[PDB]
């Protein structure tokens, strides 16, 4: 029962299953 992805901050999933729509890299999340 993992939530707010421990890699980004715009999803509630896990790294392997993570894809943050912020930039063209991996986790360009501006808040974190
Ligand atoms: Zn994520």
From Swiss-Prot:
It comes from Mason-Pfizer monkey virus. It comes from the Viruses. A zinc finger (CCHC-type) spans 3-20. Nucleocapsid protein. It is found in: Virion. This is Nucleocapsid protein p14. The gene is gag.
